[PDB]
Structure formats: C-alpha cells, structure tokens
Design a protein around this ligand. Structure first.
Ligand SMILES: [Zn+2]
Ligand SMILES: [Zn+2]
Lengths: 343, 343
C-alpha cells in the first residue's frame, strides 16, 4: 500500500538530531568486514547496537548459516544476516506486510583491506539514517490509529570469493534467508502464509555514494514503485531540497518515462535475486550504466573509499529513501519534527 | 562432468524400439491438463506409468504442495511435480551429482481447452524419449564400471493464472521444489550438502516443436554447455542425421560463436528462475526471437495444437537432447543398440 506526500511533508524529512548525521552513522562501517573475521563482528554489533539504542521500539534478529567457499577449503565460513523490524501495535506480527529495505554489509575479501565505501557501507548508512527519520512519524501515526510494518535486512556474504564465475558462489546470506523464510510457515489463521510471503516490497540498495548515479528499472512488477521513487526525487529537486543537484540537474532515474511493458533491461545479479526467484516483489536501486551495465569506476578497486564518496549525493539518497518509505507507509501529515515547549 | 562423442556414437542414438516413437509418447499428453483437474491426474499418471514400465530401473517420486491462485478464491490448488531418477549402482544416492532435465506438464487455464502442444507437451515427450534412449547405454557403461546420475523433473503449475502481472503468480511447482530441496539436508558425510546442491546441471526445455526455433544462451555460467549442445547439433546436421534441416541449414543456436563475457541477454522468466536464484547451474532451451524476446506465433493461442507441431523438428530435438545427455554422462562407446543373435 501507499499514500501521497504534500510539499510540506517533504520539507520536514530530516530527523531532529543534528548531531547524529550520515557521516557519523557511516564512519564505524568504513572498515574491512569480511565474513567470519573480527571486523565482521565489530560492524555487525555496531549496527545491532545502533538499532537497540536509537530505535528501541524495533526488534532485532540474526539469521545464521555457514557455507564452504572457493577459498575456505574444508572450513565453513559463517554468514550472519541482521534483521530489524517494527510493526504497528496490537497487530499480530504474522498479519503484517513489510516494506523491506536491504543492503549488504559484508566486504570483498580480495584485495586485502578493501573498504567498499559505496559497496555497500554507504547504502547501509542510508537505510539506517532513513528508518531513524521515519520512526518518529510512525510513532505519531500509530498513536493516532494500516496492516503494514517496516523492516531492514543487512545481508552478509553478498560478495563472491572465487576467481572464476561460479553459480553457488556469492549471495550466501540472501540465499539462506530467502530459503529459510520461505519455509517459515505462519499459522493457518494468519493473513500471510510464510515469513517470505509477508514481504510486501523489497528495496535493495547497492553501489550508492558515487556522484551522478544512473538507476534503471529492472523489474516490471515494481516499475510503478520505481516511478514513485523518481517522482519524489524530481519534486525534491524542484523544491531545492537536493544538495547534489541544481533545480535543472538531470534525473538519476533514467527509466522514469519508460512504459512498464517497454522495460527491456537485464537484471544485475545481486541479493534481490533469491527473493525475486521465490516470488518477492523487488526494486533494485543500484548505480550502473543503463546500456553496458558497468558499475561505477571505483567498483572493486582501492579507490572505493571514504575520500571518493560524495557526501552530498549520500545525503540526497538518505532524504529520498526517507521520502519513499514515508509515502509507502502513508505518513503524510505526520512528518513534523518541531519540538514542543521550544521557540 | 562430460565426455566426447565419436561420429559413430552419433549414428547409434535412436532407441531399438521403433514401435514406441515420439508421436506415440506425445499423444497421451496432448489434452487439457490444468492443475487440480482430472486431466492433470490422467497426464501425470501416464508419465509415471511410462517410467515405471519402460524405465523400471528408475525411481519415481512426487513433490506435492498447494497454493491459492488469483482465480481460486479461498481454495488451495494442488501442484504435483514429477521426479524420476537413475543413479549408478552401489553408490550412495546422496553422493551423486545429477544431470537434471526439466519441462512443465501443466497447461494454461484460459482459454478453456488450451492444448499447449509446444508449451510444453512436446518438450515433455522430448525428455521422455531421450532418457529412454540413453537408459540402455547407461546400463552398459555401468555394468563395465563416475559419480553422476540422470534426473527428470516434470513441473506443475508453471503457467500463471491471473490477468495481470503478479510476482507470486506462476512457477508454483518449481518454486516449491527448489524451496524444499534447498532445505533437504544430506548427512554430513555425504559429498553433497542438500538435494538442491546435488543438481550438477539443470536443462529446462520450453516452447519446442515449432519450426525454425531460435535458442539464445541466457546464463554465462552454462555457456560452455550451450556451446557443447550447439556443436552436437552442427555435427548432426553435417552427418545428415537431422530431418528438419539440410546440410546447409541455419543453426538454431544463435549465440554459439558469442564469447561468454559478451553474453548480454535478459533471461526469460520460467521454471529455471527459482533454481538459478538459489545457485543451481541452469541452461534454458526455449524458442524465442533473440532480439525482441517474443515467443513462437502460436504461443498461448488455440493454434498451439498438434496440427501446428513440426514432427521433424521434434524428432531432431529428441536426437539432440539424447546426444547432449550421452556426452554429459560420458557414454561414448556404449551407444550401440544392435541386437545379439540377430542378422
Ligand atoms: Zn562488491
Ligand atoms: Zn505457456
């Protein structure tokens, strides 16, 4: 489901805490975080603690598996997906449809020390920042009260390990989660049948934080959601709320005028593929040239670091995803973050 | 794994029983077979009985689920996948990798009476005919004796039911099977980890039986298998063993010279998608214009019936898939079907 945001709603998107900004949320992610390593545990527990302190009404959960990789020999490498969710009160969680926002928090193993600032530390911080901004509005609109909640998934083991293309290499966390949630059966009485079927919309963020991204629409079934996202971007650009673009900047959403039945782009293999293959509606927000399909220039090089991040672009992304989630959840009229007893 | 077929091996592909031909195997399939209907049970039990009588060394199994559809209201429609397999003797089945050949045996529900002769009755008969031809050779080569078996899957509920594009509509049987086999854990001691992981190669046949098919390569990870299939076709055409093409006929395999890293085609959503999303190597043999992506003209019309089937093309397909399976299983030198004590 979804609502419609007034221009006023769009001018009240930022969260009231100016001291906790995206650079602040991003910084502890910008470290090597290969699966199974100490850096993975440090980043994972940073994310969990962020939700536990700043978003205490959310429930956090981990989904754990292990798998051999092309470089692990006989040893199983563990993959730990991080799930956080918040549902409306006095609703059976098994009756809730979830807007589900996703990014991978693991980092590539080769070269040693690889940071992956756009891949996907910055996507992770965009999600974290955005759900922080909408949590206050969700509390307001649920205090006034429909059967939809909000969910984030930070996936482990997205990145492949082997030198050569191998079908079961990569997407370790997303394959395990989809596979497990597809067999997590609800009661017969519940509105939804499985934990997987309760995903109303899966939005996967990947390779964001570079300047001038190009975002194609890859799934007809979510092209309308794509067009809603592009509209919010356009409106924000007009109202001048975008820092990385002037009022006449080019739109990132190259397929925005394309007809759903005219969409002819090959999907990019990534974490949405296991979910999409089992029938989940997925929207894949990934920066990639729409024609060739080639990723940003820093992709999988040492230059994918903090110094090459565009923080104005990252702030625009956070605002855009906040606006998209607020529209989808129908938070129109509940975005005011002015503080009472303060002039 | 795989072997190499001599020109002699290619001249001995047909099965010794001339009275059981593809028209014979195909005919009982060419009837309405909507999931949950009496026609579905009649076709399903025809297939099971075919394996049980003509291929008695194979084990047959059914995977059963049920699901609501856009047109079933509150009622669950059952979906019954048919599995048959044969593994080398004195091998733990849990240590076997499977060449897995697939087609859907359900038929479209609208319009009433739809036959789907290419979609996919003829694919089903191609598989049935081919594994019949290679079963005798498998017995010969296993009597002489490596860790690979042969498997067929006739999927139910491929076809979608709703008027409008819907993510969880369609692929009912393939989603359930992949989902269940992905959680079917073998013993720790077994060479393979799950029933899904034991699939070495999944070859999906769809929309075959029309003249002059065009078959693109859709998955880099199986492009070499694709090129092996195209080679066998070319060699067969040269040796004049192909009935639908002269020695200078055009090849069906349009991507045969294309470099694996130059493959830029959007996959066709179909039964291989759930498996591919969970890491199975899939080769998708489907007739479709390589550019537009549009299916044969009879697709989903009443003209997709027996009268529009090209039986020479169907016989060529059966020979080609027999040759491909025999190469993959390394049956070179074991294809002679001459009969002892007969001049
Ligand atoms: Zn990467
Ligand atoms: Zn069809």
């Amino acid at each position: 489901a979804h609502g419609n945001l007034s221009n006023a709603d769009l001018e009240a998107l930022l969260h009231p805490d100016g001291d906790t900004n995206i650079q602040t949320i991003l910084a502890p992610l910008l470290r090597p975080r290969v699966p199974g390593t100490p850096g993975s545990e440090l980043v994972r527990n940073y994310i969990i603690q962020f939700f536990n302190s700043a978003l205490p009404l959310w429930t956090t959960e981990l989904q754990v598996s292990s798998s051999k990789t092309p470089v692990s020999g006989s040893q199983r490498i563990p993959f730990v997906n991080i799930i956080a969710y918040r549902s409306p009160p006095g609703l059976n969680e098994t009756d809730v449809g979830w807007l589900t926002l996703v990014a991978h928090y693991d980092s590539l193993k080769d070269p040693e020390g690889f940071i992956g600032a756009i891949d996907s530390a910055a996507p992770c911080s965009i999600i974290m920042s955005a759900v922080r901004s909408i949590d206050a509005a969700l509390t307001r609109k649920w205090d006034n009260m429909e059967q939809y909640g909000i969910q984030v998934i930070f996936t482990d083991g997205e990145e492949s390990f082997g030198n050569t293309l191998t079908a079961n290499d990569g997407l370790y966390g997303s394959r395990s989660l989809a596979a497990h949630w597809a067999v997590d059966k609800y009661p017969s009485t519940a509105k939804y049948e499985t934990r997987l079927s309760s995903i109303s919309l899966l939005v996967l963020l990947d390779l964001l934080g570079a300047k001038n991204p190009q975002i194609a629409s890859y799934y007809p079934v979510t092209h309308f959601d794509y067009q809603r996202l592009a509209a919010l971007e356009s409106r924000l650009r007009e109202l001048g709320q975008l820092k990385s673009s002037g009022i006449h900047g080019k739109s990132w959403f190259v397929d925005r005028t394309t007809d759903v039945r005219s969409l002819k782009r090959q999907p990019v293999e990534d974490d949405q593929v296991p979910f999409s293959g089992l029938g989940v509606k997925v929207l894949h927000v990934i920066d990639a040239d729409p024609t060739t399909g080639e990723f940003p220039s820093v992709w999988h090089t040492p230059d994918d670091d903090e110094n090459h991040l565009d923080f104005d672009t990252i702030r625009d992304w956070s605002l855009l995803i906040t606006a998209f989630a607020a529209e989808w959840l129908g938070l129109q009229g509940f975005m005011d973050n002015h503080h009472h007893h303060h002039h």
